[PDB]
Symmetry: D3
Subunit: 152 residues, 6 copies
């Protein structure tokens, strides 16, 4: 398993697609321990047409979704390594989300960095927690438990 993955590899692992694939690159990855990835934020995103007019703010809930997708990638690769064929048959689902705090608004031009760490994992159940960061500052924090389920 490698520690750097680009959009080409992310597409083979996650089932998410436009406009809900919110992870552009993975810069760090340690099986069963953690992942550091990021998503660039540009004004050229449909979401900003409505959030908000003349005041582009990346939705806090989408920041969380981004953290979870990172967590999902970590959970899957920790178990099966980089396996596109099997990834194609699994899908990660949100079971819970706790302790979410928004500290700083995210705006176009920002590099939304996801920092997730494994709090607990047994089989298909994974509990991850971490933060979203912009140039070293914590813009958000969150904890969530996900499940690796069958796609079919």
């Amino acid at each position: 398993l490698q520690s750097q993955f680009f959009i080409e590899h992310i597409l083979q692992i996650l089932p998410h697609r436009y406009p809900m694939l919110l992870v552009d690159r993975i810069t760090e990855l340690q099986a069963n321990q953690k992942i550091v990835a990021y998503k660039n934020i540009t004004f050229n995103e449909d979401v900003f047409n409505g959030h908000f007019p003349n005041k582009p703010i990346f939705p806090g809930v989408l920041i969380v979704e981004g953290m979870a997708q990172s967590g999902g990638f970590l959970a899957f690769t920790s178990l099966w390594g980089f396996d596109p064929e099997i990834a194609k048959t699994k899908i990660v689902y949100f079971m819970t989300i706790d302790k979410v705090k928004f500290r700083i608004p995210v705006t176009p031009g920002d590099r939304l960095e996801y920092h997730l760490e494994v709090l607990k994992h047994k089989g298909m159940i994974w509990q991850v927690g971490g933060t979203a960061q912009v140039d070293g500052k914590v813009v958000a924090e969150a904890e969530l438990k996900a499940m690796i389920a069958e796609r079919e």
Copy 2:
């Protein structure tokens, strides 16, 4: 007590594709609100969540509950006031105790049920559930702060 999309557009600053509340069916100042958003396949979000298997994002269910809560908090203090609405902004500080029990799909009428857990000044704490046809599909607690726009 019953507000339609037009009224909603005058209170919330959210616009397409992030205004996730279609109609308000109940509102008791400082107490509770019941509102909903219809889920249809004709939504852009379904192109990627997911291809060949449409599932309304859990995070968007939460966003929907927040918007309902913020509408509750705002109207409770200022009522249906478009003019004042433009001078205030309701952003969320925290979100806690979120649980997803059932997937929401095209055809569902996603109903939001939020009650004011507590409020002090401009800090409001709401909580409740997301319901589809009488069943709880999600639940969450949120803390919001009402501030002056700008």
Copy 3:
């Protein structure tokens, strides 16, 4: 009942022109009852009209045609995804359409279509579009099913 996943296996239409979310009643060569939810979160509302969301009357008719199409596919070949994936549908005629009440975000647009006449791939249906029991539209139409190529 047939859900979005099932509808997708039969109708060729896709986003943003698939306007039927669920089928509630189906009786071969007789009639069909289905619906589509209307939410503000639809791209059409950006232009129809700004600050005044009104589902286009022509899309209500499209939704009725698609409902009729699903009735046609299944009456002809049953629920067969394999044969379905080779076909598309063309509108032939539209007639006697009347709009009585505007459809807006929050509405559950229900389609009620019955077979008026059919032969081969050519089907003629008629009925109404309803929101909470009240007729919001009436229409008759004839459509043709044809091979992708």
Copy 4:
């Protein structure tokens, strides 16, 4: 009252906007009588993503909508002339549609020409009828009644 109008003139009269403004140019207009206009059809339009995958066919219902908007422009300018200030607070509701027949499929690269004639009009209620044409051939026929109304 001119006889040729361009997209900028159409935007000041019709309340329709993207993705439902289906008239690109008006080539000839006779008040309270007839109007000829057209909309270019390109693959670069969102409806094609879903109608149908791998086989782009401009929706018949949108051709009717286009004929309706051509009628609406005719109807409005016949009433108040070319007045954007009066126009900016009006909308147009479809009332009835009759005897529409589609003869030829419309596809990308086509110049969809609308020919509408006023069959009967009273106040805000206009009943127009005509055809949609591509390269001189009739691809569609339709009769419709629309109402112009003040937004409230």
Copy 5:
């Protein structure tokens, strides 16, 4: 063939919405020139931002359409109408030069691309020509591309 419609264009170019800017090919002479076009309609997403109340087809996209037309010419010159082989090739555009914009392009216009082969040496193809609207030159440009395996 000499006249290719959208269905054919789709089988040769990998470009898809909203970046497939060639609707139909009207003339094609292997290794010499290609005449094609793209209709310009207000119902295009690009006009939402370029520019509000003043729809003007982006000049860079006129050049993109010309580049796409050059690629179809190059490709069809090597293998003709071959969808299967098309899936295994890519046309990288290396340079763009001498482009001049003389007349703005707007909704209602039939943007016609006129490109000819200026030089073909190996995997490198150099094309140049003009974009026209109703007989008049609206733009001109030269482009160099390389053929390679996808």
Copy 6:
């Protein structure tokens, strides 16, 4: 006239809007001389749906557009400073493009940096030239001439 502007400032100066506003932030600006700006590239952009499926590549022509917008922002602030009121009465027309080279493909996760210097300028006619950079490496080169015009 400062040297750093964020999206809220770019919105008030450039007339470009979604999905054609391709500059997210300004980092360096010397009136009548040079400018350095950037646009974050994310998979979450509609343009990638068609360029190309299963292989996101930011269109070379859009990189040039991005450089033009940066130049236009330089030009306008050079002649009027940060004046939203006057900016609202203008648009920009591409006049020529020359010497463009695409050396490295741009993909999601990249920080597309625009470097432009003023080659020549008189009245509303500005001629800039420079490069587009990603992590210090030249990804593209171009020279272009634009004109600021009264939107009449």
